[PDB]
Design an enzyme around this catalytic site. Structure first.
Site, PDB file in Angstrom:
ATOM      1  N   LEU A   1      54.074   2.916  68.658  1.00  0.00           N
ATOM      2  CA  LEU A   1      55.443   2.437  68.862  1.00  0.00           C
ATOM      3  C   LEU A   1      55.482   1.296  69.880  1.00  0.00           C
ATOM      4  O   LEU A   1      56.233   0.334  69.724  1.00  0.00           O
ATOM      5  CB  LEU A   1      56.355   3.575  69.323  1.00  0.00           C
ATOM      6  CG  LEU A   1      56.666   4.659  68.292  1.00  0.00           C
ATOM      7  CD1 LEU A   1      57.604   5.697  68.891  1.00  0.00           C
ATOM      8  CD2 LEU A   1      57.280   4.035  67.041  1.00  0.00           C
TER       9      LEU A   1
ATOM     10  N   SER B   1      53.317  -0.242  73.900  1.00  0.00           N
ATOM     11  CA  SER B   1      52.489   0.020  75.063  1.00  0.00           C
ATOM     12  C   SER B   1      52.705  -1.071  76.098  1.00  0.00           C
ATOM     13  O   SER B   1      53.167  -2.165  75.772  1.00  0.00           O
ATOM     14  CB  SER B   1      51.005   0.120  74.680  1.00  0.00           C
ATOM     15  OG  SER B   1      50.443  -1.155  74.415  1.00  0.00           O
TER      16      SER B   1
ATOM     17  N   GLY C   1      53.176  -1.182  80.702  1.00  0.00           N
ATOM     18  CA  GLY C   1      53.023  -0.556  82.003  1.00  0.00           C
ATOM     19  C   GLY C   1      53.059   0.961  81.922  1.00  0.00           C
ATOM     20  O   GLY C   1      52.471   1.652  82.755  1.00  0.00           O
ATOM     21  N   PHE C   2      53.741   1.479  80.906  1.00  0.00           N
ATOM     22  CA  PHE C   2      53.944   2.918  80.771  1.00  0.00           C
ATOM     23  C   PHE C   2      52.767   3.658  80.125  1.00  0.00           C
ATOM     24  O   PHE C   2      52.677   4.881  80.226  1.00  0.00           O
ATOM     25  CB  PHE C   2      55.224   3.192  79.978  1.00  0.00           C
ATOM     26  CG  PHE C   2      55.279   2.480  78.660  1.00  0.00           C
ATOM     27  CD1 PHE C   2      54.960   3.141  77.486  1.00  0.00           C
ATOM     28  CD2 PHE C   2      55.638   1.142  78.595  1.00  0.00           C
ATOM     29  CE1 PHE C   2      55.006   2.482  76.269  1.00  0.00           C
ATOM     30  CE2 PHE C   2      55.684   0.477  77.381  1.00  0.00           C
ATOM     31  CZ  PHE C   2      55.370   1.148  76.216  1.00  0.00           C
ATOM     32  N   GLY C   3      51.873   2.919  79.470  1.00  0.00           N
ATOM     33  CA  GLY C   3      50.789   3.517  78.701  1.00  0.00           C
ATOM     34  C   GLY C   3      50.929   3.199  77.221  1.00  0.00           C
ATOM     35  O   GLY C   3      51.370   2.107  76.859  1.00  0.00           O
ATOM     36  N   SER C   4      50.564   4.144  76.359  1.00  0.00           N
ATOM     37  CA  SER C   4      50.668   3.930  74.915  1.00  0.00           C
ATOM     38  C   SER C   4      51.446   5.063  74.274  1.00  0.00           C
ATOM     39  O   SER C   4      51.211   6.230  74.574  1.00  0.00           O
ATOM     40  CB  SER C   4      49.281   3.827  74.275  1.00  0.00           C
ATOM     41  OG  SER C   4      48.483   2.864  74.943  1.00  0.00           O
TER      42      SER C   4
ATOM     43  N   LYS D   1      52.979  10.161  74.093  1.00  0.00           N
ATOM     44  CA  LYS D   1      52.694   9.177  75.119  1.00  0.00           C
ATOM     45  C   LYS D   1      51.403   9.497  75.854  1.00  0.00           C
ATOM     46  O   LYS D   1      51.219  10.606  76.356  1.00  0.00           O
ATOM     47  CB  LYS D   1      53.851   9.092  76.113  1.00  0.00           C
ATOM     48  CG  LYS D   1      53.584   8.148  77.266  1.00  0.00           C
ATOM     49  CD  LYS D   1      54.802   8.051  78.184  1.00  0.00           C
ATOM     50  CE  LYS D   1      54.466   7.302  79.464  1.00  0.00           C
ATOM     51  NZ  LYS D   1      55.689   6.901  80.204  1.00  0.00           N
TER      52      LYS D   1
ATOM     53  N   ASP E   1      65.839   0.495  70.376  1.00  0.00           N
ATOM     54  CA  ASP E   1      66.079   0.432  71.808  1.00  0.00           C
ATOM     55  C   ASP E   1      67.160  -0.607  72.096  1.00  0.00           C
ATOM     56  O   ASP E   1      67.431  -1.469  71.262  1.00  0.00           O
ATOM     57  CB  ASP E   1      64.789   0.251  72.630  1.00  0.00           C
ATOM     58  CG  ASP E   1      64.240  -1.160  72.585  1.00  0.00           C
ATOM     59  OD1 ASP E   1      63.076  -1.342  73.001  1.00  0.00           O
ATOM     60  OD2 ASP E   1      64.956  -2.084  72.160  1.00  0.00           O
TER      61      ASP E   1
ATOM     62  N   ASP F   1      64.251   2.704  87.048  1.00  0.00           N
ATOM     63  CA  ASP F   1      63.968   1.586  86.144  1.00  0.00           C
ATOM     64  C   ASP F   1      64.988   1.520  85.003  1.00  0.00           C
ATOM     65  O   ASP F   1      64.642   1.335  83.830  1.00  0.00           O
ATOM     66  CB  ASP F   1      62.533   1.675  85.617  1.00  0.00           C
ATOM     67  CG  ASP F   1      62.040   0.359  85.013  1.00  0.00           C
ATOM     68  OD1 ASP F   1      62.574  -0.716  85.381  1.00  0.00           O
ATOM     69  OD2 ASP F   1      61.123   0.412  84.158  1.00  0.00           O
TER      70      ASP F   1
HETATM   71  C1  LIG Z   1      58.510   2.781  78.555  1.00  0.00           C
HETATM   72  N1  LIG Z   1      58.479   3.606  77.373  1.00  0.00           N
HETATM   73  C2  LIG Z   1      58.928   3.007  76.136  1.00  0.00           C
HETATM   74  C3  LIG Z   1      58.590   3.907  74.968  1.00  0.00           C
HETATM   75  N2  LIG Z   1      58.942   5.220  75.432  1.00  0.00           N
HETATM   76  C4  LIG Z   1      59.404   6.117  74.548  1.00  0.00           C
HETATM   77  C5  LIG Z   1      59.765   5.744  73.304  1.00  0.00           C
HETATM   78  C6  LIG Z   1      60.251   6.735  72.487  1.00  0.00           C
HETATM   79  C7  LIG Z   1      60.739   6.792  71.149  1.00  0.00           C
HETATM   80  C8  LIG Z   1      60.856   5.692  70.202  1.00  0.00           C
HETATM   81  C9  LIG Z   1      61.294   5.959  68.944  1.00  0.00           C
HETATM   82  C10 LIG Z   1      61.405   4.961  68.035  1.00  0.00           C
HETATM   83  C11 LIG Z   1      61.043   3.711  68.429  1.00  0.00           C
HETATM   84  C12 LIG Z   1      60.612   3.533  69.707  1.00  0.00           C
HETATM   85  N3  LIG Z   1      60.233   2.310  70.137  1.00  0.00           N
HETATM   86  C13 LIG Z   1      60.388   2.202  71.556  1.00  0.00           C
HETATM   87  C14 LIG Z   1      59.684   0.940  71.990  1.00  0.00           C
HETATM   88  N4  LIG Z   1      60.376  -0.148  71.330  1.00  0.00           N
HETATM   89  C15 LIG Z   1      60.170  -0.034  69.900  1.00  0.00           C
HETATM   90  C16 LIG Z   1      60.868   1.225  69.439  1.00  0.00           C
HETATM   91  N5  LIG Z   1      60.518   4.498  70.546  1.00  0.00           N
HETATM   92  N6  LIG Z   1      61.083   7.996  70.896  1.00  0.00           N
HETATM   93  N7  LIG Z   1      60.838   8.774  71.975  1.00  0.00           N
HETATM   94  C17 LIG Z   1      60.345   8.025  72.960  1.00  0.00           C
HETATM   95  C18 LIG Z   1      59.950   8.285  74.234  1.00  0.00           C
HETATM   96  N8  LIG Z   1      59.512   7.334  74.973  1.00  0.00           N
HETATM   97  C19 LIG Z   1      57.986   5.755  76.345  1.00  0.00           C
HETATM   98  C20 LIG Z   1      58.040   4.840  77.495  1.00  0.00           C
HETATM   99  O1  LIG Z   1      57.694   5.253  78.544  1.00  0.00           O
END
Ligand SMILES: CN1CCN(c2cc3c(-c4cccc(N5CCNCC5)n4)n[nH]c3cn2)CC1=O
Length: 273
Positions: free
Chosen positions: A12, A14, A16-19, A35, A96, A135
């Site tokens: 999805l 990556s 600063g937060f990781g992957s 994550k 997002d 943040d």
């Molecule tokens: C900084 N960061 C950004 C992504 N994030 C995250 C995304 C998701 C998502 C998600 C779902 C669908 C799309 C998506 N991405 C996020 C990044 N931009 C593209 C869409 N993330 N679902 N649950 C999540 C939990 N954490 C973890 C995180 O630390």
């Protein structure tokens, strides 16, 4: 064994937060986000009640993941030899807030009101749980496109909430308040209100108000899009140079611009579908 419990999908994102990968819980097909964070890159560590060394992020997520709300919930976590793996809720369909703004440009105020209100409720929830996000910004908020609900993500820069000064910061600079820039000190709630001001400006103008340190320090807000006087006033209030001059959460939500918010579902039907 997380290996067998989850079907791993595409990356999805990556940074600063990781992957973070798309995933599906094998047991019930629940959509998830997986994550990965390397231990070598974990700066702030914390402890579980049962006494175990863990990323602060995990501590913060637990405190905040109880019950329903506008924060992405931690479903499970695992420790690996050189990394921690977190299993997080994943809404679908989702986008997002950063991508949403980029796509639609400046938001209609009715929409920004609904979004901003939901962010406020989420942040209040964190603070009630003893957690400071640190943040707050468009990239750290997800929009559930079917339900009109926003969800706060990424607690990797967060901290336990306290009433004394913070002297460390690892969030996004252009969202950091003038007192951090000038003095490397801030208080939690008032720094949070500042970032909420940046966020709200970003929603209604389609971009961030300040790019350089000196602009932040000067604190002069110029509006590049048409924005009502009430909204301009709320923004300028959140972005007061003196922390003590900023509104409390209660004062923000009692502000005239904040009245008559749409429900999330109404918001999706009008603006999202
Ligand atoms: C900084 N960061 C950004 C992504 N994030 C995250 C995304 C998701 C998502 C998600 C779902 C669908 C799309 C998506 N991405 C996020 C990044 N931009 C593209 C869409 N993330 N679902 N649950 C999540 C939990 N954490 C973890 C995180 O630390």
């Amino acid at each position: 064994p997380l290996e067998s419990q989850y079907q791993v999908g595409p990356l999805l994102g990556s940074g600063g937060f990781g992957s973070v990968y798309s995933g599906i819980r094998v047991s019930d097909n629940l959509p998830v986000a997986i994550k990965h964070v390397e231990k070598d890159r974990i700066s702030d560590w914390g402890e579980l009640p049962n006494g175990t060394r863990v990323p602060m992020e995990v501590v913060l997520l637990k405190k905040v993941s109880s019950g329903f709300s506008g924060v992405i919930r931690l479903l499970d976590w695992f420790e690996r030899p050189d990394s921690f793996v977190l299993i997080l809720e994943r809404p679908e369909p989702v986008q997002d807030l950063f991508d949403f703004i980029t796509e639609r440009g400046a938001l209609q105020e009715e929409l920004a009101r609904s979004f901003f209100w939901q962010v406020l409720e989420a942040v209040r929830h964190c603070h009630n749980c003893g957690v400071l996000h640190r943040d707050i910004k468009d990239e750290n908020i997800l929009i559930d496109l079917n339900r009109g609900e926003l969800k706060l993500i990424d607690f990797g820069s967060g901290a336990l909430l306290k009433d004394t000064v913070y002297t460390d910061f690892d969030g996004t600079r252009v969202y950091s308040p003038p007192e951090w820039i000038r003095y490397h000190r801030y208080h939690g709630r008032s720094a949070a209100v500042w970032s909420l001001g940046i966020l709200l400006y970003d929603m209604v103008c389609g971009d961030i108000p300040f790019e350089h340190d000196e602009e932040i320090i000067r604190g002069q807000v110029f509006f590049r899009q048409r924005v009502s006087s009430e909204c301009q006033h709320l923004i300028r209030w959140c972005l007061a140079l003196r922390p003590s001059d900023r509104p409390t959460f209660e004062e923000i939500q009692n502000h005239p611009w904040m009245q008559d918010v749409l429900l999330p579902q109404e918001t999706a039907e009008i603006h999202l579908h």
